[PDB]
Amino acid sequence: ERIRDLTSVQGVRENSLIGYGLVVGLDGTGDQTTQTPFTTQTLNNMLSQLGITVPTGTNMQLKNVAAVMVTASYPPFARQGQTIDVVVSSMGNAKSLRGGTLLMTPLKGVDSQVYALAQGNILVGGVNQLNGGRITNGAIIERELPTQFGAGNTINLQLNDEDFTMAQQITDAINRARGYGSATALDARTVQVRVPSGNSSQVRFLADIQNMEVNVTPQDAKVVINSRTGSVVMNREVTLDSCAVAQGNLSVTGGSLQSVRSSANLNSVVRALNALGATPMDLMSILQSMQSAGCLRAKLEII
Amino acid sequence: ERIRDLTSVQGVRENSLIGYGLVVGLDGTGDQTTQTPFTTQTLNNMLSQLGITVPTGTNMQLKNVAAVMVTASYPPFARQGQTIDVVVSSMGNAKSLRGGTLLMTPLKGVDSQVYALAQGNILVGGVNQLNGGRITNGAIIERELPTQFGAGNTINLQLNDEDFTMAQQITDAINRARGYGSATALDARTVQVRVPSGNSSQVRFLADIQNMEVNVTPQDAKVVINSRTGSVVMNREVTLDSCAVAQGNLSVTGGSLQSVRSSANLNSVVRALNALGATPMDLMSILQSMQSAGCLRAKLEII
Amino acid sequence: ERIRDLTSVQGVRENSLIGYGLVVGLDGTGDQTTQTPFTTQTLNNMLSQLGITVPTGTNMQLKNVAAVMVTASYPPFARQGQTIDVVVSSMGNAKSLRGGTLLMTPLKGVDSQVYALAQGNILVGGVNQLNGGRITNGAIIERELPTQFGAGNTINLQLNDEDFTMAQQITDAINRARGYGSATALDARTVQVRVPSGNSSQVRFLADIQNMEVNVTPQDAKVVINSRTGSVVMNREVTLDSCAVAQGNLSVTGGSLQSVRSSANLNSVVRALNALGATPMDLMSILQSMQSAGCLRAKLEII
Amino acid sequence: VMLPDGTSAYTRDGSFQVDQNGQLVTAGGFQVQPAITIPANALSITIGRDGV
Amino acid sequence: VMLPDGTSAYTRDGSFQVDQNGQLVTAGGFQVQPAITIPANALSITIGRDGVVSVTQQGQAAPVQVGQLNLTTFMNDTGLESIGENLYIETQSSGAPNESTPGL
Amino acid sequence: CAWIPAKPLVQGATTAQPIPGPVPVANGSIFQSAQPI
Structure with a gap:
């Protein structure tokens, strides 16, 4: 299941639909x-x-009436008569949408x-949001999109995260179980595969491709800090260098300057950073300062 | 019962009907x-x-009078004289619809x-909604829709969720119990089957098809987060990579940076995430940060 | 009694009658x-x-006078002189209709x-509704409807719920106890039967047909959620896949992420969902999130 | 005088005004049954000794 | 009126004020069911004999209404429990609080 | 003297016919953008 969880097929994409309703x-x-x-204007129109x-x-x-905006996703290869889920969000000074019913709403595209x-009927949780709900199978597809799937002998697998090593690995995996020249990587994010001419033939080929398993290679070292939620996440490839850290109200347990041991793997990093006895709010500043100094050998992203 | 629970027949669809009543x-x-x-205007009209x-x-x-909107579903192959259920929803400043009776209401189409x-007579629950009710067999069909069912030798089964592997699997299942070339997949969501010319012949063919059982193949790894209801759902194909997680008021039970063990199956993922001792509100932020970092090897959807 | 409880005869239908009275x-x-x-205007008219x-x-x-609307059903093959039940509902600012008497009211059609x-005399329950009552045999039929029953050699049985398997099963059941070509299915909801020319002959044929018993085949897996009354109903064909569920104030009894065991039959589903210890209000959100993720292998309908 | 609830009251205050649909009403807005609708093109209103 | 706990209380003090999100509230800030929202464009607020709340605005010859002020009627007014802060609650006596528009 | 032919100040056409738009491509997207400037 690796190839399907790592890539997406070219032309197999979801669109966004929006509409207004009561x-x-x-x-x-x-x-x-x-x-x-x-x-009231739209009620009078109705x-x-x-x-x-x-x-x-x-x-x-x-x-008992609220004006709402309905949002949905147009799925790949959607055919008229199928049903999709919609999200209903109030638009003006409405207290709740607890047991309301969405009247006929046309969902427009771009x-x-x-x-x-x-x-359909809105399902509101019931600290829960009252002006937002979801209707399962609340919308029926009325229009179809033409596509080029089944035409040509090339199909592009687009990697979710760009990586030359991962692109080459997928290329070598497709070219091991599916012939010599069945795949060629075009860039860090695209693998072009050669497919038989036809429609069902490409479906069969992609069914084979999608469930293949590729050995994921080390993927960059990065520390993600979310200051708005106060969370820090470090992946396995994060290392440290030996350096001294000082911060307010933190001390060796005996001065205020605590030595952080060089660290090779992630367990060493976790132990060294927990030795400081730092709250995550303090840990964010510590990580930023260490990235500035050079102890932290990782890519610090603030999300 | 797999094919009926997974697909829908082309042209066999439900429409939406709406009307106004008292x-x-x-x-x-x-x-x-x-x-x-x-x-009062519509009462005077009546x-x-x-x-x-x-x-x-x-x-x-x-x-004792309330103006309401009635919504219903026009079922496939509906014939005049049959009865359907309707949903009755109040439209303006009405306290309740407890024991009301819906007067003659014409349900229009698009x-x-x-x-x-x-x-008919409205059934209201009696924390229950008072301005919304349901009438079972409250509406009688008066118009029929022409259809192309029984014409031609092709019938499309439309998969509810797009998948090349599942489309190919249904194609191979139909082509095992119903002849060599009885089904051909057209895209990730459509399987075209060859049916005999006629009306009852296609009914018999689809009756055979619908109850066939197909072995469902692994289907993507995804974590669904509903922030409005505060719920998280992870399917079986969700995995984790070894990485460190820090969040407010959460600590190893001894620093604030807790190591999450790499995890292969879903039980390992559940145990690793429960080791953090995180409330689901905190767990949502943890999952989002891990998806940003790369520990979470799944597709994070916010519904 | 299966065929009568599953289908309806073409042309044998009930109409709706409405009228105004005091x-x-x-x-x-x-x-x-x-x-x-x-x-007062209509009292002066009287x-x-x-x-x-x-x-x-x-x-x-x-x-002591209230203006009311009377609703009734015109039964199939109704003949003048027969009696039907009516429902009497108050129309404006009347406190009760406890022991009132409905004066002569003409029930109009569409x-x-x-x-x-x-x-007739109204029967009001006596938390009971006071402005709504019912009169048994309160209306006498004065007009008859012409019908085509007894003309032609085809009669359509219309299935209450559309199903190709059920239509084919009824076709095979009628064609087992009533000759080789006595029934032909036209679509997922209609079975056309060949009847002898005449009026009593068709009555006898349909009397035979109606009490026949058909073995009901598995019928789709669906979870019905009524948020307005807070109820959840799952039929036998609902299954589950192994996945993790987290929701507010729910925990393993020890983290907040509880693993739901894959489930094949309905008893397994009930046990797995009761293991979560979820209130039905929480269970609705859990089911919606699981349907979004893919654990719930059923059709979620919100009524 | 006709009250909004429909019951009849009695007054000796003879200060009446024409409402927006004609009609003689009391200063509080209560109508003066027996009712009196005054046309738009009226040049003068005359109330006589015999109530005419 | 609506107590902070969520249960309804009953008062006869007729001093009301519009708070920062419209809503006629009592002097203590408790909201006055059945909820009355006053717009900011109001030039004058009129509470009628039958509890109709009409609001006049600029460039609109016809006064824009807001809602109905419903009164609660009990069958034994002596029996309500005095909470304290100018509020009465239905005791076992004075039960079945009957809502009604004023005048009837 | 008012019959002498004269050239107006705003010469040319005083109207423009909207040009029909390009045919959308078959990429599976609803958003289709004409040749971007």
Whole structure:
């Protein structure tokens, strides 16, 4: 299952669909509709379409209706009649969407064409979000996308993470179980494979390819710091050099300057960094300072 | 039962029907009708149709009537006279729909044509939703849709989830119990089967096909995180690499940087992640940071 | 009794009838009639018809009269003189319909023609609904519908739920006890049977057909979630795959990530899901997340 | 005078005003049954000795 | 009115104020069901005889309403439990609090 | 003197017909961008 988990097929991709709708059946937790004119305007549009023309000059003050935006993913090779999941998010001053029902909503693409029609019952968790829900199989595909799959004798596998070693390894793995010249790497992120002419032939070839297992090679040393959530993650290839670290309210347990032992593997790094007795908030600053000095032999990314 | 649970037949699909109606018989828990003019307007329309013309200039302040939207699904091969379930959702400032009765409601399609007529008694749970109910067999089909089923010698089975391996597996399964060239995969999501010319012949063929069992192949490794409900779900094909994790108020039980053991199967992953002693809210951030670093060898989806 | 409980006969269907009436004899629990002008207007109409012309300019403030809507079902092959049950629902600001009597009410069809005449005593339960009641044999059929039953040699049995396997099974069952070519399936929802020419002959044939028993075949795996009532129902064909589940305030009983054992039958699924110790409100989110991930091998419907 | 709930009250305050649909109402907005609708093109309103 | 615990209390003190997110609240800040949101464009707020809350705005000859102020009626007003902070709760006596629009 | 032919100030055409757009490529994407400037 390595090749499918590492790469993606060229032309097999997911698009994004968006639309506007109304959610009805709320228990008095909808829009105020005095500060969100589009809710009442679109309700009047729906009624006018259905055969009820409400007078232009009138005051409608609803409480069970909310104006929402619906987002979905158009899956690869989607055919009309299939169903997809949608996400429903409130748009103006609505308290909750607990037990609402999404009315008929056309999901447009980037090209402003309807690719799906959405309508269903929203499932809201019930510290849980109240203005956001999900409808499983809530939208039906109405339009299909032409594709070039099955045409030509080349298929590109696109690596999720760029690596010359991994690209070469996938090339050598495809060229071991599937013939001599069945794959050629084009760059650090693309492996071009030669496929038989046809549609089912390429499907069979890619089915074979996808479940093959490749031995993942060492992949860069990096320390990911998320300051907004206060988390630090170090992969296996992170090392350290011997150097001294000082920080506020931290001391040898006896001065404030603690020596960090050079470290070869990740267990040594973890032990050396835990010897400092540093909170992760302090550990982030320690890692940044060590990266500046040169003790930390890894790529420090702040996400 | 695998093929029916995995695929859908081309042309065998469900449509969405919508309509507007009134719910009567509520115990003073209907619309205020002073802030929802369409309720009184449509009640006057109904009376005028029935033979009662209420004066244009008058004040009607009802309490047992609510204006509702009715939604239903038009089932495949629906014939006139059959019954379907409908969902009734209040539209404006109604307290409840406890024991109301849905009056005659025409359910329109996307093409604004009446496909069903809805009327019945609403069943409301009774923390339960009060403005939303369901009527079983509450609508009768009045229009039928022409279809191309039974015409031609090709039928497409559309996989619910795109997979070249699964498409090839279904193709090989249909071509084992039903002849040599009875199925051909067209893409990652479509399997074209050759069916005899006729209507009952295709029904028999698809009845045979649908209950066949296919051996499901490994299907991608993915971690689904629902932040709105605070849930994390990992399938069997999720693995881990050895790396260090630090987060606020979490420590080895002795520093704050805990080593996560490489993990091959899902039990190892669960044990390694439970060794951190992390709340799911913290676990979501841990998983996101590990995906950024590269320890988590899976596809992280946020739903 | 399987065929009658699974299918319906073509042309044997129920229509919906609606009408407006007045309910009298209430113990001061009728309309205010100052906010519902149609009650007094229709009472004056009734008096004018009966021979009493109340002056146009006058104030009538009734308390024992309520304006109601009456709904009924027109049964198949209904003949004039037969009686049907009706449902009486209040229409404006009436407190109760406890011991009221429904005056002569013409029940119109969709074509605005009188098909029944309704008049009787309302039975109200007495947390019970007060503005809604039912009258058994409260309406008498006055019009009959022409039908094509007994004409032609084809009769369509329409399956309640679409299934190619079930359609084929009914076709084979009818063709086992009633001759070689007595039934042909037309689609996933229709079985066409060949009947003798005549009226009583078709009645006899359908009497034979209806009580036949068919062996119901596995029917799709689906999990029904009703968030408005907070209920989850899983049928027998629901399975699970091994995967890890995390949710708020749920832990192994010891981390927060609990492994759910792969499950083949429904008992295994129930045991695995009860091992999580999840409230149904949490179980709904768990099931949705597992459907997103891929552990849940069933069709998740939100009703 | 007709109250909003529909019951009739009685007043000796004779200060009446025309509402937005014609009609003579009390200063509090309560209508003065027996009702009196005043047309738009009115040049003068005359209330006589015999209530006309 | 709605207590912070989530249970409803009943008061007769008629002093209300609009808080920073509209919402008519009591002087202690407790929200006054059935929720009344006042827009910022309001020039004058009028609470009617029947509890109708109408709001006038600029460039709109017709006053924009906001909601209904419903009163709770008990069958033994002597029986409510006095919580303290100008609030009464339904005891075993004065049960079944009957909501009603004012005037009827 | 007002009948003398004269050349207006804004010469040329005072309208432009929208040009039909390129045919989308068969790459499996909904977003299709014309020749970018």
